[PDB]
Amino acid sequence: NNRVVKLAAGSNTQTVLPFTGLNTPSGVAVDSAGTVWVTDHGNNRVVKLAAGSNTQTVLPFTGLNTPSGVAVDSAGTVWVTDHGNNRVVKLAAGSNTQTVLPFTGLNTPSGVAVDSAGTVWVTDHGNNRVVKLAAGSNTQTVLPFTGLNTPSGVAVDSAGTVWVTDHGNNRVVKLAAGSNTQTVLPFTGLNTPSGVAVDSAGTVWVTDHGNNRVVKLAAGSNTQTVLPFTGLNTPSGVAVDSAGTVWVTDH
Ligand SMILES: [Br-]
Ligand SMILES: [Br-]
Ligand SMILES: [Br-]
Ligand SMILES: [Br-]
Ligand SMILES: [Br-]
Ligand SMILES: [Br-]
Ligand SMILES: [Br-]
Numbered sequence: 001n002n003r004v005v006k007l008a009a010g011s012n013t014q015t016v017l018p019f020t021g022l023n024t025p026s027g028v029a030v031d032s033a034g035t036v037w038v039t040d041h042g043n044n045r046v047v048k049l050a051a052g053s054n055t056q057t058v059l060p061f062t063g064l065n066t067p068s069g070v071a072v073d074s075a076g077t078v079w080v081t082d083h084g085n086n087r088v089v090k091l092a093a094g095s096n097t098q099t100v101l102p103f104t105g106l107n108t109p110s111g112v113a114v115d116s117a118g119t120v121w122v123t124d125h126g127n128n129r130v131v132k133l134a135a136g137s138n139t140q141t142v143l144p145f146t147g148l149n150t151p152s153g154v155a156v157d158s159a160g161t162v163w164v165t166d167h168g169n170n171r172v173v174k175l176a177a178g179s180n181t182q183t184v185l186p187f188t189g190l191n192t193p194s195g196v197a198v199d200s201a202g203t204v205w206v207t208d209h210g211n212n213r214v215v216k217l218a219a220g221s222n223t224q225t226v227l228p229f230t231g232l233n234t235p236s237g238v239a240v241d242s243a244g245t246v247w248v249t250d251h
Contacts, residue, residue, distance in 0.1 A: 001233050001250040004028060009244035012228045025249040027070035027080070027111070028237040029194075036247060037078055039067045046080050048072060055172045060096050061089060067236075069111035069123070070156070078146075081109045081122060088112055098126055102129060102138045111154035111195070113162075121162060123151045130154060130164055132174070144180050145173060147248055153195040157202070165193040165206060166222060170195060170207070172206055184213040187215055187224050195237035197246070205246055214248055216240060 004025060006016040019025075023042025028035050034051035037059075044067065046059040061067075065084025072078050076093035079101075085214075088101045088109065107126025112118050118135035121143075128149065130143040145151075149168030156162050163185075170190040172181045173181045188192075191210025198204050202219035205227070214227040214235055227246060229235075236251035 001088070001231065003250045004036065004247060005229055005244060005250055006247045007227055007229065009246075014229050017049060019056050022047070024251055026068050026236040026251060028170075028239045028247050028249050029070045029078075030052050030239040030241050030247055031072055031076075032040075032241060034178065034241070035072075036239075037070050037072055038249060039070045039080060041066055041068060041083075041236075041251075042060045044058060045085075046078065050167055059091055061091060061098050064089070068109070069113075071114045071120075072114045073114050073118075074116065079112050079114060079120065080207070081112045083108055083110065083125075088120065103133055103140060106131070106235075110152040111164075113154045113156045115156055121154055121156060123154045123164060125150050125152055130162060131201055139156040143175060145175055153193070155196045155198045157192070158197045158200055161187075163196045163204060165196045167192050167194060172204070175228060185217060187217065190215070194235070195249075197240045199240050199244060200242060201244075203240075203244065204238075204242060205238050207238045207248060207249070209234050209236060214246070 002022045005014045015060040026041040027039035036049045044064045045058045062115045068083040069081040076180035079090045086106045110125040117178045120133045128148045151164045152167040153165040171184045195207040237249040239247045
């Protein structure tokens, strides 16, 4: 539906954000200030809406092709998976020069996530794996997930646990750092899930793209719920801030 919708925690009444001219928006990311970044996938661009503004800005990336995931940090740096060019690119706040990260061997990468250390994780969707780029050293490693099939979304929480939507297997998996135990989350009945978001409380939200719905596992619960969005079609991406406001790209 070429729009971005949000729901405040406990609300039944979504808001449509005043983005304009979106074409198949995919990734979304938010910071604590309420700023929203969206990969406008069909237009090969990344757009941004500052809180209280009604007019988006376009980040000065160049040469993107079918960009997918987007991530941001507290310094205001923005990373975008340039899915069509098998690369990840970033822009620092206030800068006109984009930087191609030293990942190697990516194929149709999907999601991107970062932590406060500057570590970057990418779902290397076409290679059925998640790759981590260590800050400073730029060492690449492959996380020991197993059995992934076209993974798409990725998120990392403050404890450093990696969540992935295992899109081709209709499931969501998580893996703590250093670990060789992956946990399948008790979501049920998913179809080509596409985005995942996690808050500090440990709640997890997933865009269940094939079922036109956003599902949630509240922290300490084993019962999934469906957020009361209205009119969603193939939601792609999801982001949450501290408080449980949820933004979704209604791709
Ligand atoms: Br305005
Ligand atoms: Br600027
Ligand atoms: Br740089
Ligand atoms: Br790590
Ligand atoms: Br399984
Ligand atoms: Br809910
Ligand atoms: Br999607």
